[PDB]
Amino acid sequence: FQRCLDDHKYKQAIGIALETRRLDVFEKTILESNDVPGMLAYSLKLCMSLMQNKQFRNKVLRVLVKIYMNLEKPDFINVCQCLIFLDDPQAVSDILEKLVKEDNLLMAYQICFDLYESASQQFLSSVIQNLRTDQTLKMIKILSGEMAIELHLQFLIRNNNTDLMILKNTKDAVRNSVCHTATVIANSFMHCGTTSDQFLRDNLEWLARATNWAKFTATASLGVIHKGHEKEALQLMATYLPKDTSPGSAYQEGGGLYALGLIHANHGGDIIDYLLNQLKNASNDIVRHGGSLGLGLAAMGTARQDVYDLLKTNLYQDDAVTGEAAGLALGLVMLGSKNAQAIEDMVGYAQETQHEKILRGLAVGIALVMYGRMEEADALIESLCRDKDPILRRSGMYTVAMAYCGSGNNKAIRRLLHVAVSDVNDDVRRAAVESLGFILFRTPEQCPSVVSLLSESYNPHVRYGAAMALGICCAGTGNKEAINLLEPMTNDPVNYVRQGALIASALIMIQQTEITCPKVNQFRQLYSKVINDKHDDVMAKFGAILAQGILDAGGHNVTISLQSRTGHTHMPSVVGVLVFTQFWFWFPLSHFLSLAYTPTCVIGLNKDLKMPKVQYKSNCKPSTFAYPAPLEVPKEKEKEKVSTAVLSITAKAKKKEKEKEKKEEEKMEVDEAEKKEEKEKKKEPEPNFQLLDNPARVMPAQLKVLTMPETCRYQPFKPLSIGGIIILKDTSEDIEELVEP
Amino acid sequence: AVDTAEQVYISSLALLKMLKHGRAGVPMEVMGLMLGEFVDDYTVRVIDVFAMPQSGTGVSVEAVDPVFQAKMLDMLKQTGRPEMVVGWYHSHPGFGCWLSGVDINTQQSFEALSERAVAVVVDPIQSVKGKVVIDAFRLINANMMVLGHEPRQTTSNLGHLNKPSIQALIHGLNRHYYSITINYRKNELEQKMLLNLHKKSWMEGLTLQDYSEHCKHNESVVKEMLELAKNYNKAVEEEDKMTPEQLAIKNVGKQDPKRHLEEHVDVLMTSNIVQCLAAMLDTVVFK
Amino acid sequence: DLYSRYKKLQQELEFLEVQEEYIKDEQKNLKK
Ligand SMILES: [Zn+2]
């Protein structure tokens, strides 16, 4: 190592220093002489990307924050890149109280936004308890995440690019089947978070045609449109109460309660208490669904005891139909908890009951009670796989997915795929090969190489979960190798594996134009083909209409990503996607994918209210992309002719007629002309410097090619190469131009 | 408040009573009852099946004997378990499965008395090889003529288990009755006792079949394997550019070069090793 | 680069040992 000191190159030194687990040698190579003090930026990504163990990982991560505190400026990156992994609540609260104490409310204002976007529930609830132990009330709201929601609501109400006619050209092709549910899940997706009501307004008699569970689904879709609508939604569905809609319709009032849960997800308030008091005073059966699904969704990740107690005595009712309702919600309130009583009561209750709906609700629930434990589940992981209950073996496969999310464990991928080949039920073979993407989504290079040969199996159940493994591993990238695999998958003989190929195709290419990847316009007309064909299966075209809703979700402004901004992983985008895969067993679980709709936006709010109108531009390399025009080109074709092929004596007859024009045309008068190259002229001087205001949609590809106006004086604070929210460093004087609709 | 994509659980003990009693009276369309429990809205289970004495009429409402009914139910109350009847079945030998015009009237009688009263149709003489032509059905109303018959809902397990077959939709499918799915209440301690007791051999595992026919069979394969090797000589020394990817495909015959080859080498290997290895063990074990 | 190449060779090596494992396992289970 002294030779590595005599190297003067110290990345050679830092290799051995992390091999032999010694850490004072680690500290000295960064507190060396002045040779690039951003070696910590190399070492952070080195510990971020390729560290398998977690036992000494936090130790190396917290010997980093010793030199970050000993660095000149503490605030910027070290908290939300290290301490949220190291989950120290009061360490964050104290040093941010330090940052307020020197009267520095500009960068503490930044780090609270970055903390709320990245870090999870109950870490923010724990730090905000140690907050209150004004500008303090300013940092209450931006750590409780209040005003981040309304600006996110402000972005989507300003920007809305949906073609109304696309859903009209699918609506008229719907026969008297139960594709009405497939349409109302489509417009809810592509008006999610928009608060736009026109399809629940104009064709309202058509909406009243489908019944008895579409009424449950359609009024659940109403909560999807009003996602993040905190106070205005409670007075909105103060029209459709659980005692004012209809004394004969419980599906109306049941899905209303589930719609309140879809609005206020990850938001504690009176609505938890309001939904708790209506599970006290409840009707017979199908008020207890959307009550419990809504209540477990609003109390997700809270580990709240009082709601957890009554969901048990809801579960021990042994009612057949609320068993799916209770078991899903019982896991959501204990998500990532690792409780003694929760696993034991739910795996205890999973045998003496005599239905299997009750098993399927508790299937996902006991998989979701543990989340990212990474070694701490293996006694339960082994015990669920050994049992002779096929649903409980299937649930153990979801559990090993959710405990090992984003880790390249060889022990996972060995054990998870050994049962994929060997096991005798086919449903457990799916959830084996559906768990592939949950553990490998962080490195999407491997998932085409490992699922491609399983996509050509002999049974369709392996080929089904092969297709949705591509949909979840490569989440929203332009991978095009997964698209290369899905091309014969959507042309399968079996119907439901065609369905899964359509939905996985819709997941991979959201917000991607033709120049981004060429297979976009191939698949949009392919969706159009199998939705306008009359002799295809309803189940085969169910995925097609749902692929319409995914592909333009939120008016080309939201996206899905299990991966977050700052290297951290989402808890809602993982829970939102896997309970969405339980749409075979229950269609109204399809609303849960709206939890994973993360926005594509940059907002330059510098003060608490001040969002200045700042025009800044991108520098896309030869041309433009991004968020195209709607297509209104139905047809107007004409048969109009059959060409006269008379090659008889006409041939010499027309020739002597052309001689008759050689006396008439060139000897009396002829002059007519037109000008060339006017239409070629305007194309080449084009931009690639497109200025943008700051409600600004931005692709996650073009985050790196956008540039602040250096000719403008107002510069941002954070390095502006990644989308989300930043603050402006407002320099001079005379600030104006605030805008709110 | 309407039907879904339901589920029918039949016990393992039921199914053997079904297709033995059907195979017994193969010409004459046997008849029996179906005894289980309506467990919830949209699953149903049946645990037990007993037959019926056959009348001159055949499968109809008159073959249901009410005095044989209550007496058979009575002597199952005190022994085993009492439960409610959940349907009925009959055997259709000459064709797979569909409710006839007399089948549809006796379904009306039971669905008026009971909740749904699932019928079962079993073809014994078609169910032979490794699959069983058994199907279950349920009569649909005509009051929903302006609404969706088969009122199914929020699930994706309707396109499985059968597409509606052409020989069954030519009859009252799908405007008089609907199909319903069948899977089996299959458990351990009945699975293993039927596995291990039907196919087992203990002392046979180290017998000899000794050598007068074993070493004779070692002549029985080698001889044509010699001639088939000479046929293997023929194609390999041929090796002409007759567009050899076309020359290989225009003479597929389940024949010489690899198909009628080492398949024999496998059988010569497996027979002689298992013979000689069991021979060396008996010298080891017995003194 | 000299350390980052070394870990990327390990991660791929761990991966394509797993893929040769189950294909050898699947081909056994496919013969039945
Ligand atoms: Zn009959």
Curated annotation (Swiss-Prot), chain A:
Residues bearing PTM N6-acetyllysine: K534
One cellular-component annotation, GO: nucleoplasm
Signal peptide: none
Keyword Repeat on entry: yes
Residues where Phosphoserine is found: S648
Modification sites for Phosphothreonine: T644
GO molecular function: enzyme regulator activity; ubiquitin protein ligase binding
PC repeat start-end pairs: 217-250, 255-288, 290-324, 325-359, 361-394, 395-430, 431-463, 465-499, 500-540, 543-575
Keywords: Acetylation, Phosphoprotein, Proteasome, Repeat
Biological process according to GO: proteasome-mediated ubiquitin-dependent protein catabolic process; regulation of protein catabolic process
Record's compositionally biased regions (Basic and acidic residues): 656-666, 673-686
Top-level taxon: Eukaryota
Chain spans, region Disordered: 653-695
Family under the similarity heading: Belongs to the proteasome subunit S1 family.
Function: Component of the 26S proteasome, a multiprotein complex involved in the ATP-dependent degradation of ubiquitinated proteins. This complex plays a key role in the maintenance of protein homeostasis by removing misfolded or damaged proteins, which could impair cellular functions, and by removing proteins whose functions are no longer required. Therefore, the proteasome participates in numerous cellular processes, including cell cycle progression, apoptosis, or DNA damage repair.
Subunit note: Component of the 19S proteasome regulatory particle complex. The 26S proteasome consists of a 20S core particle (CP) and two 19S regulatory subunits (RP). The regulatory particle is made of a lid composed of 9 subunits, a base containing 6 ATPases and few additional components including PSMD1. Interacts with ADRM1. Interacts with ZFAND1.
Protein name: 26S proteasome non-ATPase regulatory subunit 1
Origin species: Homo sapiens
This protein's encoding gene: PSMD1
Curated annotation (Swiss-Prot), chain B:
GO molecular function, one term: K63-linked deubiquitinase activity
Keywords assigned: DNA damage, DNA repair, Hydrolase, Metal-binding, Metalloprotease, Phosphoprotein, Protease, Proteasome, Ubl conjugation pathway, Zinc
Motif JAMM motif in this chain: 90-103
Tissues expressing this chain: Widely expressed. Highest levels in heart and skeletal muscle.
GO cellular component, one term: cytosol
GO BP: double-strand break repair via homologous recombination; double-strand break repair via nonhomologous end joining; proteasome-mediated ubiquitin-dependent protein catabolic process; protein deubiquitination; protein K63-linked deubiquitination; regulation of proteasomal protein catabolic process; response to ethanol; ubiquitin-dependent protein catabolic process
Annotated residues for binding of Zn(2+): H90, H92, D103
Annotated ranges, domain MPN: 8-143
Residues recorded with modification Phosphothreonine: T243
Modification Phosphoserine, positions: S127, S201
InterPro entries in the cross-refs: JAMM/MPN+_dom (IPR000555), JAMM_MPN+_peptidase_M67A (IPR050242), MPN (IPR037518), RPN11_C (IPR056263)
Pfam families documented for this protein: JAB, RPN11_C
Gene3D superfamilies the UniProt entry points to: Cytidine Deaminase, domain 2
E.C. code: 3.4.19.-
Family: Belongs to the peptidase M67A family. PSMD14 subfamily.
UniProt function note: Component of the 26S proteasome, a multiprotein complex involved in the ATP-dependent degradation of ubiquitinated proteins. This complex plays a key role in the maintenance of protein homeostasis by removing misfolded or damaged proteins, which could impair cellular functions, and by removing proteins whose functions are no longer required. Therefore, the proteasome participates in numerous cellular processes, including cell cycle progression, apoptosis, or DNA damage repair.
UniProt name for this protein: 26S proteasome non-ATPase regulatory subunit 14
Organism: Homo sapiens (Human)
Lineage: Eukaryota, Metazoa, Chordata, Craniata, Vertebrata
Swiss-Prot record, chain C:
Subcellular location per the Swiss-Prot or TrEMBL entry: Cytoplasm; Nucleus
Superkingdom of the source species: Eukaryota
Family per similarity comment: Belongs to the AAA ATPase family.
Function: Component of the 26S proteasome, a multiprotein complex involved in the ATP-dependent degradation of ubiquitinated proteins. This complex plays a key role in the maintenance of protein homeostasis by removing misfolded or damaged proteins, which could impair cellular functions, and by removing proteins whose functions are no longer required. Therefore, the proteasome participates in numerous cellular processes, including cell cycle progression, apoptosis, or DNA damage repair.
Summary of subunit composition and partner proteins: Component of the 19S proteasome regulatory particle complex. The 26S proteasome consists of a 20S core particle (CP) and two 19S regulatory subunits (RP). The regulatory particle is made of a lid composed of 9 subunits, a base containing 6 ATPases including PSMC4 and few additional components. Interacts with NR1I3. Interacts with PAAF1. Interacts with TRIM5. Interacts with ZFAND1.
Protein name: 26S proteasome regulatory subunit 6B
Source organism (scientific name): Homo sapiens (Human)
Taxonomic path: Eukaryota, Metazoa, Chordata, Craniata, Vertebrata
